[PDB]
Structures are given as C-alpha cells and as structure tokens.
Design a protein around this motif. Structure first.
Motif, mmCIF file in Angstrom:
data_model
loop_
_atom_site.group_PDB
_atom_site.id
_atom_site.type_symbol
_atom_site.label_atom_id
_atom_site.label_comp_id
_atom_site.label_asym_id
_atom_site.label_seq_id
_atom_site.Cartn_x
_atom_site.Cartn_y
_atom_site.Cartn_z
ATOM 1 N N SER A 64 0.825 -1.202 0.000
ATOM 2 C CA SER A 64 0.000 0.000 0.000
ATOM 3 C C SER A 64 0.871 1.268 0.000
ATOM 4 O O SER A 64 0.599 2.212 -0.744
ATOM 5 N N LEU A 65 1.914 1.286 0.830
ATOM 6 C CA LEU A 65 2.825 2.434 0.868
ATOM 7 C C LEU A 65 3.504 2.674 -0.495
ATOM 8 O O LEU A 65 3.569 3.798 -0.994
ATOM 9 N N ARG A 152 -19.624 2.329 -6.203
ATOM 10 C CA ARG A 152 -19.304 3.673 -6.700
ATOM 11 C C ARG A 152 -17.933 4.133 -6.194
ATOM 12 O O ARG A 152 -17.595 5.322 -6.260
ATOM 13 N N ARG A 153 -17.119 3.195 -5.733
ATOM 14 C CA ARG A 153 -15.796 3.527 -5.230
ATOM 15 C C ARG A 153 -14.846 3.820 -6.393
ATOM 16 O O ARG A 153 -15.164 3.587 -7.571
ATOM 17 N N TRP A 154 -13.658 4.303 -6.051
ATOM 18 C CA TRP A 154 -12.642 4.550 -7.047
ATOM 19 C C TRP A 154 -12.109 3.240 -7.582
ATOM 20 O O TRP A 154 -12.523 2.160 -7.136
ATOM 21 N N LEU A 155 -11.177 3.362 -8.531
ATOM 22 C CA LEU A 155 -10.640 2.174 -9.207
ATOM 23 C C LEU A 155 -9.197 1.864 -8.775
ATOM 24 O O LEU A 155 -8.406 1.331 -9.556
ATOM 25 N N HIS A 156 -8.853 2.205 -7.536
ATOM 26 C CA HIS A 156 -7.588 1.744 -6.942
ATOM 27 C C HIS A 156 -7.874 1.023 -5.637
ATOM 28 O O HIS A 156 -7.233 1.260 -4.605
ATOM 29 N N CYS A 157 -8.859 0.126 -5.691
ATOM 30 C CA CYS A 157 -9.263 -0.577 -4.490
ATOM 31 C C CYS A 157 -8.230 -1.575 -3.987
ATOM 32 O O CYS A 157 -8.412 -2.139 -2.896
ATOM 33 N N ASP A 158 -7.161 -1.790 -4.751
ATOM 34 C CA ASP A 158 -6.052 -2.624 -4.314
ATOM 35 C C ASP A 158 -5.188 -1.943 -3.241
ATOM 36 O O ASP A 158 -4.374 -2.608 -2.602
ATOM 37 N N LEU A 216 -9.882 -5.213 -2.830
ATOM 38 C CA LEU A 216 -8.710 -5.296 -1.967
ATOM 39 C C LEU A 216 -8.410 -6.768 -1.705
ATOM 40 O O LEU A 216 -9.324 -7.527 -1.355
ATOM 41 N N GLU A 217 -7.158 -7.173 -1.865
ATOM 42 C CA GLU A 217 -6.818 -8.559 -1.549
ATOM 43 C C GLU A 217 -6.660 -8.712 -0.038
ATOM 44 O O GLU A 217 -5.632 -8.318 0.523
ATOM 45 N N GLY A 218 -7.683 -9.286 0.600
ATOM 46 C CA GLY A 218 -7.652 -9.514 2.031
ATOM 47 C C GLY A 218 -6.562 -10.491 2.398
ATOM 48 O O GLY A 218 -6.162 -11.337 1.585
ATOM 49 N N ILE A 219 -6.016 -10.343 3.604
ATOM 50 C CA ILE A 219 -5.081 -11.364 4.084
ATOM 51 C C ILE A 219 -5.817 -12.708 4.137
ATOM 52 O O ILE A 219 -5.196 -13.775 3.984
ATOM 53 N N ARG A 220 -7.143 -12.666 4.308
ATOM 54 C CA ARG A 220 -7.902 -13.918 4.297
ATOM 55 C C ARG A 220 -8.038 -14.545 2.906
ATOM 56 O O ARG A 220 -8.482 -15.685 2.801
#
Lengths: 296, 296
Positions: A64-65, A152-158, A216-220
């Motif tokens: 993420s950083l 309706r979120r943005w397209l950088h959900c990663d 978002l790729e969850g740790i799960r």
C-alpha cells in the motif's frame, strides 16, 4: 484504564494516553486522506497476546505504501517490535483474555496544503491497540444480513487507503438496513464489502472474484485458499454475477475482525434455507485450527 | 508572523497559531477521510480584503455536507462571520495587498473507530486563511501545460470531499510531467482536473461537459456561463471526447485559485498555435470586471 497509543509526527515519536494524542491540522492524512492503513488481529490466551498473520499484513502495508509513493519507515522487524511494544503498553487497558486489534496508519505527513507530494515529506505514523469483539456465537449460528448496492468507489481498491468516505457511506447504508455489510456490485459482478471480502458456495464449490483493482486482496484470501484445500473443498476464482450471488448455496464474509462469517439473509431474503451451511462450518473450524497452529 | 487558524472539536472552539492547532487522532477526518471542504478566494485592495462569490461557496458547502449526512454547524451568516473573523485575525500574517484563500474543512468528528456514522457525532470544523498566489503574468501570457490520464476516481465527484488520495495522485502525476494539471477522461470523455474544471473552445464556441456525478460543479461553472453571455460567446454544455479535446482551438482551466487559465500545451503538444486565444482573453477580462463589480 485509558488506551495508550503510538504517534510519530515529523520524526518525533511518543507513546501516550489516547486523550493526549493529537496530530497537526495540516497532516495530509487529515487534509487529503493521503495515507494507508492496516488492521491486525491480536489473539489473547489469558495474559498472552499474539498477532495472527502479521507477516502478511506487514507485506500488504508495504505494498500500500509503495502504491502511493510513501517510503516505508520501518523494516519488518521494526514494525513487529512497534506492534509488540504497543500491545504490551495496553495490557492493563485490555485486561487478560481480551483479544485486540492493532490499527496502523501511515500518512504522507505535514506540509503546506498543496495536492502534489511535498518535497522531503516525513511520514506520520499512528498505531492503536483496541479491544476486538469477534462475531458472537449467536451470529455464527444464525448468520448475518447483507444488503447489496452499486459499487461507486474509485478504481484503486487494491490500495488499503484512508480515503474512506465511499466505504463509510456503504457501511452506513448497511447499518440503516439492519445489515452487517453492503456487498457491492460493479458491471453486474460482485466486488467486495465496505471492509470485507465476499465468497459464495454453489454445489459444494467455494467461489471468489479474481484479484483486481476493484477488490482489496484480504489477508484472508490466501488463508481461505489454504483452508479450502485442507478441507477438500474445491476453490474457484471467477466473476460472480448478481444472479449467482442471489442463488448461492452459501454466502461468506472475511476480514481481520470478522474471521469468516456466514451471510444468511441478502436484501431481506433468506440465503437458501437461511441457516449457515456446511462449507462455512468446515472453513470456520479450519480457521480456528490455523489460529491455534500459527500462534500456539 | 505565524498564520492564525480556527479549530472547533467536540464543540470547543479556538483561534490559535497554526503551530498550536492539533486534532484528536480519532477524528474521522484523519481516520476515514470523512469530511468535506471549501476554498474561497479573498481579494485584497491594500488592507481591505473581501471574499469572492462566498454565497455560492457556502451553498456548495451546504450541499456537500447534506450529501454525506453531516448537519451544517452554522447558518450562512454564521459562516460569513467566521470567515470574516479569521481573515481579520490574519491581517498581520498576510500583510497589506496580499490575496488569500480561506480553506474550510468539516468532518464528522471524533469517535471510536468504526465505519458507520457514530451516534450523536459533533462535527469538527477547521478553517485557515493563507496567502493566495494567483497565476502569474507569465502564465497568462504563455499558458500552462496539462497532461491527460484515465479517470480512476470514485463516482461521487459531485461531493467536495477530503477523501482526496485519488486527486493527490493526479496532481502528482501532473507535477512529474512539468504540468499544471491532469485532465481526466472517463469512457473517452473529459471529466475534470484534479482540482479544476475543464473547458474547450472550438470555432468560437465555449464548450464544457454537463453537470454530473463524475464532475464537481465549480463555483466558476455558473460564473463563466455569466461571463460568456456578457462577452457574446456561445456556450454549449456537451460531452467532449478525447479527439475534440486534442483538436480544440483553446483549452481552459477554472478554479478558485486559478480564476480562468489558458492551457497551451497538452501532453507535450501545442494547443493550436501554442498561445492563449481570444476567448481566454475575453473571459479573463470579464472575470476581472466581475471581481471589481461584486467586491468593490
């Protein structure tokens, strides 16, 4: 006992009572939502507290950083030490037997207000350990309710970012509808919840959407792959359209705070027979084994 | 002289030196980007400072607040009085002749961290007056450079929100490309800049995209409509595709801090002949008349 939190601003760090922790108004976390975060579950066995999958959480924090160009202020060992000190500092506030979450937020720091990256930014780091209430017996037995809405979120959900107004609106939508989560759909296909990933079961097979910038790729995600293989459950990564979601045999949520949770009502209609299914049961048991194995 | 800022947290308000202004770490503005903002230009004639179109800015603030369910903490007169007091408090820090911007941010306030709206939230209000440097003579004479990029923002762009990581990335992209702004395109059509609205001129006609959830309605949208009519310039609200943008006779930016600005290079190519055009010239002059008329 008041929570003790960690705060580093302009390379000056402190461990202080929550009531005393304040950030400068021009921190870009406050002005621009310009930062990322992690939530790491900390399980207690009496006075002993241990993080679960913290290596994988810290690897995501690093991703993420990097994705938003903030230099990582600690190596993995440094992050682990910070978390350990913070959890220790909160032993009395939490009490024996109390699970915790550790929240870590990193922002681009304090500068004159301007949208582009400030020259020579020093990142702000905030971390807190607070009590974790896992989903209850009752919730696991009865399952929870989700509603659906358009994504309706943005397209950088990663990126696990703190620009979360869109997620806040979806969480509030869920709350207003007596629901635990809002399952979002984009182009007619499932993406994810406001703060959880979504899975379905159809004909004995576990199904999740593919990894992408809409989810978002969850740790799960990796964990549940492991658990399904252990349980002899076929896992299929595949788009799930709205019809497939509504006709699913089971619907599941995962997140650090939810572990794995069965969804037994969707938009006020029962999911199959309205009770948690056998794939939920097997995966949930396997999750508990994974916790015991990795931490004890 | 240090800037003096306004801060209200948990219904406790202060006017203090910037170095002393800090917000609690659990403010949802810091944790969730859960807030909205305004930027109001304040023009100086010697020691006299006056806001420009502040009624329209405050009306937008009210719309942004309502759109995310935050109750508005002041009536219009109260907001006007707050701004006036803040600007007065900064007379020495700004100095005579110095234009300012007033930045107003309202967040949902401080609470235990959880995504849904907290019960009985008291909004936080932060406001600052800082010096405004308008685009220079040189920039008006030569025009500025923009680059283009795909619009990856969320789909509630009608809210002027502080969840601005997506805008930050676009502003940084522009800076890395020696550009003043990134003009975004979605589905092949112009939306807007990271913090400005976009206009083109083709065959003597002024063209802007229609009002929608992909584009923030700038206070300059209504203003420039007025100015075009005054100047006898036909205004057309219409989607602008990428080809139309690149072949435009003129490209213009508007925002509170830019006023109206000509774009004379696009992705490192000259716009027509690379010099500002006659529609820019006419609208810019009309803008200056509007400033004089409404404030003096």
């Amino acid at each position: 006992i008041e929570p003790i939190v960690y705060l580093s601003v302009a390379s000056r760090e402190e461990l202080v009572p929550l009531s005393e922790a304040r950030v400068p108004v021009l921190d870009r976390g406050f002005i621009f939502g310009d930062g990322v975060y992690e939530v790491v579950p900390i399980y207690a066995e009496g006075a002993r507290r241990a993080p679960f999958r913290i290596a994988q959480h810290l690897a995501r924090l690093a991703r993420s950083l990097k994705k938003i160009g903030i230099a990582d202020p600690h190596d993995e060992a440094g992050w682990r030490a910070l978390v350990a000190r913070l959890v220790d500092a909160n032993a009395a506030a939490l009490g024996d037997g109390q699970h915790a979450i550790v929240y870590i937020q990193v922002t681009r720091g304090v500068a004159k207000r301007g949208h582009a990256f400030p020259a020579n930014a020093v990142p702000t780091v905030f971390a807190m350990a607070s009590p974790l209430a896992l989903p209850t017996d009752a919730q696991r037995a009865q399952g929870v309710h989700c509603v659906t809405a358009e994504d309706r979120r943005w397209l950088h959900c990663d990126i696990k970012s703190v620009s979360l107004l869109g997620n806040v609106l979806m969480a509030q939508h869920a709350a207003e509808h007596d629901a635990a989560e809002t399952i979002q759909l984009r182009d007619g296909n499932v993406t994810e919840g406001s703060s959880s990933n979504v899975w379905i079961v159809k004909n004995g097979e576990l199904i999740a959407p593919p990894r992408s910038n809409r989810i978002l790729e969850g740790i799960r995600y990796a964990l549940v792959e492991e658990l399904a293989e252990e349980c002899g459950i076929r896992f299929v990564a595949r788009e799930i359209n709205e019809a497939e979601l509504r006709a699913a045999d089971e619907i599941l949520l995962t997140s650090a705070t939810k572990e794995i949770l069965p969804v037994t009502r969707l938009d006020d209609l029962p999911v199959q027979g309205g009770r948690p299914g056998p794939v939920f049961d097997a995966l949930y048991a396997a999750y508990q084994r994974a916790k015991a194995h990795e931490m004890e």
